[PDB]
PDB file of C-alpha atoms in Angstrom:
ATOM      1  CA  UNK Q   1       1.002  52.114  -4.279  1.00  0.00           C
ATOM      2  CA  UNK Q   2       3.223  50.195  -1.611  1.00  0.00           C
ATOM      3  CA  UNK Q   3       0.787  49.938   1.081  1.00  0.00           C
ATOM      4  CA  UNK Q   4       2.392  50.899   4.265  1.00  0.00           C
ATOM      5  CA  UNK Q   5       1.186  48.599   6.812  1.00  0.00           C
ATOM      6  CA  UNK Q   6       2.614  48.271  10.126  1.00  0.00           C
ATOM      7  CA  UNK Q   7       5.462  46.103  10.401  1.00  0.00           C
ATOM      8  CA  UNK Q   8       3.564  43.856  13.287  1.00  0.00           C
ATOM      9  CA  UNK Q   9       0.218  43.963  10.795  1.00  0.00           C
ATOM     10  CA  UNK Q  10       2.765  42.488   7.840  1.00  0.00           C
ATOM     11  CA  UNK Q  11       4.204  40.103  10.016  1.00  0.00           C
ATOM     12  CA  UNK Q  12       0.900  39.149  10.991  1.00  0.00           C
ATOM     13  CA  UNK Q  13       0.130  39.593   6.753  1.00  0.00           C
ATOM     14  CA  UNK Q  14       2.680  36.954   6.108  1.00  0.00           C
ATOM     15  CA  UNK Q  15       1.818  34.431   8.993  1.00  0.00           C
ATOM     16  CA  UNK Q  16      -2.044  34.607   7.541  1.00  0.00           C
ATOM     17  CA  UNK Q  17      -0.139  33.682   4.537  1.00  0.00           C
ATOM     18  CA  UNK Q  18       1.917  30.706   5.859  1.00  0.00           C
ATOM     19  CA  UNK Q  19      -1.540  29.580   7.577  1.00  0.00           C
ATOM     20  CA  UNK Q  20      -2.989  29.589   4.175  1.00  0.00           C
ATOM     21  CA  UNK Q  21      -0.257  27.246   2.656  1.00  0.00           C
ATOM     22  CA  UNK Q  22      -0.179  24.718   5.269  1.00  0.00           C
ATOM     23  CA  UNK Q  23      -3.981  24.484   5.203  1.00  0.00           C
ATOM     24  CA  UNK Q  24      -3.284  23.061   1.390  1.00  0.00           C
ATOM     25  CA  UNK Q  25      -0.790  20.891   2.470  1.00  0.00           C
ATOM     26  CA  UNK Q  26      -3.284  18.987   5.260  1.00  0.00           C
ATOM     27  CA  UNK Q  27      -5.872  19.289   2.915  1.00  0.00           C
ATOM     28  CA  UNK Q  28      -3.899  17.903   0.045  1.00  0.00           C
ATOM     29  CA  UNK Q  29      -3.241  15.015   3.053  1.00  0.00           C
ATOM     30  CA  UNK Q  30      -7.044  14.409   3.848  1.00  0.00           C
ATOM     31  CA  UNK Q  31      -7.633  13.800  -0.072  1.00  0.00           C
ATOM     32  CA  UNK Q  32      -4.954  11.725  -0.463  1.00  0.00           C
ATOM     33  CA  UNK Q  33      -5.985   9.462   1.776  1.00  0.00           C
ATOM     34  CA  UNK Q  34      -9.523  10.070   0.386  1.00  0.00           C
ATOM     35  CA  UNK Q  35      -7.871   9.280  -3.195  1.00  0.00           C
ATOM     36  CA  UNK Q  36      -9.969   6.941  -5.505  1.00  0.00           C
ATOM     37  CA  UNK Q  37      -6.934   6.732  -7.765  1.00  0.00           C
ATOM     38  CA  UNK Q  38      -5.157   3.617  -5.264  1.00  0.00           C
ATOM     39  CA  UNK Q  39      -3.047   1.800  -8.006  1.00  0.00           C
ATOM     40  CA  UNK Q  40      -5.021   3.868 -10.846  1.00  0.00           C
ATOM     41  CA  UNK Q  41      -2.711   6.425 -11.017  1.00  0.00           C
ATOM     42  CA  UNK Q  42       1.117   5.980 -11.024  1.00  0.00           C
ATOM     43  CA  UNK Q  43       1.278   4.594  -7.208  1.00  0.00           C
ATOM     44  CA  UNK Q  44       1.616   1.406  -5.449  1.00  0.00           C
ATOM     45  CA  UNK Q  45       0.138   1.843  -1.980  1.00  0.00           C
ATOM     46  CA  UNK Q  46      -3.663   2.046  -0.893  1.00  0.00           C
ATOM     47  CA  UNK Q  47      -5.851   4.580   0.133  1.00  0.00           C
ATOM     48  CA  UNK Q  48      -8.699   4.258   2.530  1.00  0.00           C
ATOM     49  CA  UNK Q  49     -11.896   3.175   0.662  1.00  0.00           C
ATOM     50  CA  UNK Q  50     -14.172   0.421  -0.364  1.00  0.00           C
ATOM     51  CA  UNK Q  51     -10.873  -1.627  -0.707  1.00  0.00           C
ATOM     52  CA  UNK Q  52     -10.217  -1.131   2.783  1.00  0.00           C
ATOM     53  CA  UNK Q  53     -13.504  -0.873   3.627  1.00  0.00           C
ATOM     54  CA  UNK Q  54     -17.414  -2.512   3.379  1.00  0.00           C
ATOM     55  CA  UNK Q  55     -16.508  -3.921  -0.387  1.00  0.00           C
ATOM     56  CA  UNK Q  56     -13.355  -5.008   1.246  1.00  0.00           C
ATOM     57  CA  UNK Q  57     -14.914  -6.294   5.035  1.00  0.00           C
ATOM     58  CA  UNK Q  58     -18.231  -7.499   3.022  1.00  0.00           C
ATOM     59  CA  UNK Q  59     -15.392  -9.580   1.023  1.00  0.00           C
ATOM     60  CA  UNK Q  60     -14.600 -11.641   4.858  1.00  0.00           C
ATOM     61  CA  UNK Q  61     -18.023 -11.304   5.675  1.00  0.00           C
ATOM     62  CA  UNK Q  62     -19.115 -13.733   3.080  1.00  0.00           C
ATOM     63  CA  UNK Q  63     -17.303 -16.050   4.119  1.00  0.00           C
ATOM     64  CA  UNK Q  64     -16.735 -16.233   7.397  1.00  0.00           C
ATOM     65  CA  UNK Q  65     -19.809 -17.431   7.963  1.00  0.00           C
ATOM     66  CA  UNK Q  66     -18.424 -20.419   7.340  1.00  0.00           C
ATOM     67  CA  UNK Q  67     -16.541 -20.453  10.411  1.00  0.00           C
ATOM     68  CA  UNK Q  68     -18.311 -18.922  13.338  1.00  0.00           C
ATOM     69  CA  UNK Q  69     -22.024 -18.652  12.507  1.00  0.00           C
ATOM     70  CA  UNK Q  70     -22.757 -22.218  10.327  1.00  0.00           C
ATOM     71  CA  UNK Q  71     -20.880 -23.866  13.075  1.00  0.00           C
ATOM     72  CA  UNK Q  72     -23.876 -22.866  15.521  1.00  0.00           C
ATOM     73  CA  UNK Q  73     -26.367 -23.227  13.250  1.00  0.00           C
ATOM     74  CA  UNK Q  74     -25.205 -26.683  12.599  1.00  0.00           C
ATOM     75  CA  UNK Q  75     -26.089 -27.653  16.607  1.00  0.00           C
ATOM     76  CA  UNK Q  76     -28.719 -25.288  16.505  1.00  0.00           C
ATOM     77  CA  UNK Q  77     -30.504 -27.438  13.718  1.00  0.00           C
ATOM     78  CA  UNK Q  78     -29.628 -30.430  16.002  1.00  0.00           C
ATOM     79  CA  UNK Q  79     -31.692 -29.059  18.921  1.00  0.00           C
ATOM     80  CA  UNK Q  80     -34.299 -27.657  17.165  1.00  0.00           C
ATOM     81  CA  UNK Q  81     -34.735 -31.472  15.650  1.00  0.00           C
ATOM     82  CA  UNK Q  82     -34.303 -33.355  18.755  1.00  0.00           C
ATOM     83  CA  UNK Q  83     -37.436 -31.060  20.680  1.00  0.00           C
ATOM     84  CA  UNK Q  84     -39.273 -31.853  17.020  1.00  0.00           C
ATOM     85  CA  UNK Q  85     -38.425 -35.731  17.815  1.00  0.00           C
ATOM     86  CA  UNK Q  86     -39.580 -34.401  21.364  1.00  0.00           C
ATOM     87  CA  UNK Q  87     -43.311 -33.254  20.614  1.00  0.00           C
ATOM     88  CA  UNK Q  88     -43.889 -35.984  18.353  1.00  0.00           C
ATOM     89  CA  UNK Q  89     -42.899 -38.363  21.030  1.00  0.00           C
ATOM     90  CA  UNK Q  90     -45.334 -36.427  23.313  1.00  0.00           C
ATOM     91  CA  UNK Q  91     -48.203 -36.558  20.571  1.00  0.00           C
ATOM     92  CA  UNK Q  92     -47.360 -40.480  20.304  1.00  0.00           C
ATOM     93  CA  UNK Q  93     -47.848 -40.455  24.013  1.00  0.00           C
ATOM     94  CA  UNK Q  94     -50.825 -38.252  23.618  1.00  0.00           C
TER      95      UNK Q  94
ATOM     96  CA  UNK B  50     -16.002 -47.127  19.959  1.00  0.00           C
ATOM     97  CA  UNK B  51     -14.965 -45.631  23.147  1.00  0.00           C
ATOM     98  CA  UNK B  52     -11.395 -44.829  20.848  1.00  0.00           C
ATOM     99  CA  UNK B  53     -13.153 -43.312  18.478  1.00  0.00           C
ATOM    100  CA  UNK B  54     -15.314 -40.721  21.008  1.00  0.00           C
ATOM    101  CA  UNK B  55     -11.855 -40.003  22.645  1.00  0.00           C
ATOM    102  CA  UNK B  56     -10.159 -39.125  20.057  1.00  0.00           C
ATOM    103  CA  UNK B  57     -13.070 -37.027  18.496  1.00  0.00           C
ATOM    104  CA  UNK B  58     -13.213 -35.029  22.002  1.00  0.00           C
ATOM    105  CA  UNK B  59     -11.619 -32.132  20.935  1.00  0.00           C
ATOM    106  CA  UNK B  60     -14.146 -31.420  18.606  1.00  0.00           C
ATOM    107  CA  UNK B  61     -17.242 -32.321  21.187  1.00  0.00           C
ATOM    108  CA  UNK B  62     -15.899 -29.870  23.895  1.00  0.00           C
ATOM    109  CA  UNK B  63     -15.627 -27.027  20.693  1.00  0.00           C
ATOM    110  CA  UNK B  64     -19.077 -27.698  19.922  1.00  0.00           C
ATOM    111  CA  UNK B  65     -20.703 -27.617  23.431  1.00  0.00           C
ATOM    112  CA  UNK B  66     -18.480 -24.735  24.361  1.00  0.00           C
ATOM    113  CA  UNK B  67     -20.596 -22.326  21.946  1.00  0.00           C
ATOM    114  CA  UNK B  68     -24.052 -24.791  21.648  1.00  0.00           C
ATOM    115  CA  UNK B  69     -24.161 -25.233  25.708  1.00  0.00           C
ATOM    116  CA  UNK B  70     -25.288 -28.481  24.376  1.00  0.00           C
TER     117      UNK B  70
ATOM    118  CA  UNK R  13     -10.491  54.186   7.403  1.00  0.00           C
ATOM    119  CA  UNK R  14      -7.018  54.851   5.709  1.00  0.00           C
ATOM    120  CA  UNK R  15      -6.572  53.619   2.194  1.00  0.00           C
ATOM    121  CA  UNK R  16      -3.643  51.225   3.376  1.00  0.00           C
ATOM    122  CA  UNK R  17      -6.159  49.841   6.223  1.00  0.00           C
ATOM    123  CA  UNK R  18      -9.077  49.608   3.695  1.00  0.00           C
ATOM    124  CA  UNK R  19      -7.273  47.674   1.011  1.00  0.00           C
ATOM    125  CA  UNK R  20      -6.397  45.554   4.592  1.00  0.00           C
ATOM    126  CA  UNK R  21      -9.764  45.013   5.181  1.00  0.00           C
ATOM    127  CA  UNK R  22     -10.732  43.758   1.882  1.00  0.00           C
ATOM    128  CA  UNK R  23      -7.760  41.561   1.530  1.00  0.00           C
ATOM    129  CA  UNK R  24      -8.579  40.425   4.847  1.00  0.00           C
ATOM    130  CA  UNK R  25     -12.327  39.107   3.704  1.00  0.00           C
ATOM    131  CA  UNK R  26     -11.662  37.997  -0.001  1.00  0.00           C
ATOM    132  CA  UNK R  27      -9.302  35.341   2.259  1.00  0.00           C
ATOM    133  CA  UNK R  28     -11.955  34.674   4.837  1.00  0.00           C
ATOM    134  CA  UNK R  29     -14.102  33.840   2.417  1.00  0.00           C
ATOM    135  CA  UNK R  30     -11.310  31.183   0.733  1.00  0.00           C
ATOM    136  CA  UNK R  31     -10.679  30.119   4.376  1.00  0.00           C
ATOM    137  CA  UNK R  32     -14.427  29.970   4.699  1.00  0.00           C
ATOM    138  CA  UNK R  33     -15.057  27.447   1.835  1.00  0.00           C
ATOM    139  CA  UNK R  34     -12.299  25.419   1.820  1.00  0.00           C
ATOM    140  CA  UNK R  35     -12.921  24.970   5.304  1.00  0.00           C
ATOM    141  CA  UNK R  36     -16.379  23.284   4.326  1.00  0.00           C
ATOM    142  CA  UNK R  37     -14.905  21.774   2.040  1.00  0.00           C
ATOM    143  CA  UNK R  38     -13.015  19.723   4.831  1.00  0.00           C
ATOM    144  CA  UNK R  39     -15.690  19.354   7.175  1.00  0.00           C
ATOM    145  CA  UNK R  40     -17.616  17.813   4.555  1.00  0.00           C
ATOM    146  CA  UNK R  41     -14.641  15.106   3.515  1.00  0.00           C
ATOM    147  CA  UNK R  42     -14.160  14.490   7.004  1.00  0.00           C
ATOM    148  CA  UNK R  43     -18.040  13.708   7.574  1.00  0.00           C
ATOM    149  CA  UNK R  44     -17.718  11.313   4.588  1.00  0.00           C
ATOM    150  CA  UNK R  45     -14.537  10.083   5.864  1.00  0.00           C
ATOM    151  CA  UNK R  46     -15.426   8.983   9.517  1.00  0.00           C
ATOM    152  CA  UNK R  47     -18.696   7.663   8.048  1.00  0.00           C
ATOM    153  CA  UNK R  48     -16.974   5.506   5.897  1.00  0.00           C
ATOM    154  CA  UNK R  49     -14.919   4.270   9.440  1.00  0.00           C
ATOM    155  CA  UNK R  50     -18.211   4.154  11.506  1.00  0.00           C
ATOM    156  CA  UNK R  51     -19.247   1.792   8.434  1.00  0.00           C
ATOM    157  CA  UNK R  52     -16.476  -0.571   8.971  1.00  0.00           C
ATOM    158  CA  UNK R  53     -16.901  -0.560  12.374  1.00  0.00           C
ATOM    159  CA  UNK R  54     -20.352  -1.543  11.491  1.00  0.00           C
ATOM    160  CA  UNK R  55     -19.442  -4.239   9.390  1.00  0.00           C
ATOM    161  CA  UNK R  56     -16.580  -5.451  11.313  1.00  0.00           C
ATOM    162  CA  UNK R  57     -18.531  -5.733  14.751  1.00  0.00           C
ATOM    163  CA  UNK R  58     -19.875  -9.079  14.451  1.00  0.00           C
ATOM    164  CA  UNK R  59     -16.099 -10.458  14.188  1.00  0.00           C
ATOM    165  CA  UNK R  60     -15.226  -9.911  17.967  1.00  0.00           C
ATOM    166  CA  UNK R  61     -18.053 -13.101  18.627  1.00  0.00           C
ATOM    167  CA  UNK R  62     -16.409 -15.391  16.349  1.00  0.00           C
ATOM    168  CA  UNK R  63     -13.130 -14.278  17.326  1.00  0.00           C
ATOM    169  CA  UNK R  64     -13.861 -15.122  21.026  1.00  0.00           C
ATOM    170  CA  UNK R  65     -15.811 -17.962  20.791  1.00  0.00           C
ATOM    171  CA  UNK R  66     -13.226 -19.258  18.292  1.00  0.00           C
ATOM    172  CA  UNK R  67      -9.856 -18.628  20.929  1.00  0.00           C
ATOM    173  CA  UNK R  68     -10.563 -22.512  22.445  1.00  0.00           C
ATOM    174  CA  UNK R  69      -8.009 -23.787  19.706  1.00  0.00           C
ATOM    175  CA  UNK R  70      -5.070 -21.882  20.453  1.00  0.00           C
ATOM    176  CA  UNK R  71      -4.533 -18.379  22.406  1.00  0.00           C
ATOM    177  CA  UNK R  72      -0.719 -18.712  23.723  1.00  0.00           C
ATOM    178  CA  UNK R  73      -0.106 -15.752  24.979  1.00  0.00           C
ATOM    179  CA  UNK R  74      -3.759 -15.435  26.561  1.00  0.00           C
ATOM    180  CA  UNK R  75      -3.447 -18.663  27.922  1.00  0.00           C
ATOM    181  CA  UNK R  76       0.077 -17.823  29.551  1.00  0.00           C
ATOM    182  CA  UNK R  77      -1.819 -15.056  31.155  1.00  0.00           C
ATOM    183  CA  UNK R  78      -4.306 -17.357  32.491  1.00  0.00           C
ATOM    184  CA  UNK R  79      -1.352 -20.165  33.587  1.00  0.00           C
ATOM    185  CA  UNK R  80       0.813 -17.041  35.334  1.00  0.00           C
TER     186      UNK R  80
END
């Protein structure tokens, strides 16, 4: 039977209704971006994950090492020598 | 020799910038 | 309750109860989502020290900040 509702309650009936829809359509946005299927499915853009992220930041990691942190180690290994050459001296002394 | 430590300078003031050697 | 309001009220809860899980649903990508960022940001937080102790080649700009 048509169900007589008030005519603010079905106003109110189709905004629920509109709220519904555009829930799917941010949804739909949050898994897109959450998409696995980056280049796998008909596409040519990325999606946030491991190829934007650790598998992709482990990827510089590796090797910039290289760079910034062998480059310290390098003098670091110098000191840590020269107070070696430092104690023997002492011990010579000694 | 004191050509070759002045030319190499750049790379001494890198190294004791981030060593404090 | 009138029949009109009843069949309201049922309507009404079968769609809170879609509402209801699909809004888990979201919370629970969105955990797993800004985990994954707070995991880069992990990862990525030891590049700021290289980056900085590495600027004594060339900065430009930086340095035309500095020479202003």
């Amino acid at each position: 039977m048509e169900h007589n509702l008030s005519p603010l309650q079905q106003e109110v009936l189709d905004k629920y209704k509109q709220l519904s829809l555009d829930l799917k359509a941010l949804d739909e946005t949050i898994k897109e971006l959450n998409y696995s299927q980056h280049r796998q499915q008909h596409s040519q853009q990325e999606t946030v994950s491991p190829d934007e992220i650790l598998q992709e930041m482990r990827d510089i990691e590796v090797k910039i090492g290289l760079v910034g942190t062998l480059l310290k180690g390098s003098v670091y290994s110098l000191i840590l020598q020269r107070k070696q050459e430092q104690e023997s001296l002492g011990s010579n002394s000694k | 020799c004191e050509r070759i430590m002045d030319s190499t300078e750049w790379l001494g003031t890198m190294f004791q910038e981030t060593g404090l050697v | 309750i009138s029949t009109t309001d009843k069949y309201f009220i049922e309507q009404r809860n079968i769609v809170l109860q879609e509402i209801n899980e699909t809004m888990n649903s979201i919370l629970n990508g969105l955990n797993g989502l800004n985990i994954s960022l707070e995991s880069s940001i992990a990862v990525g937080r030891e590049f700021q020290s290289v980056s900085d102790l590495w600027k004594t080649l060339y900065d430009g700009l930086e340095s035309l900040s500095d020479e202003a």
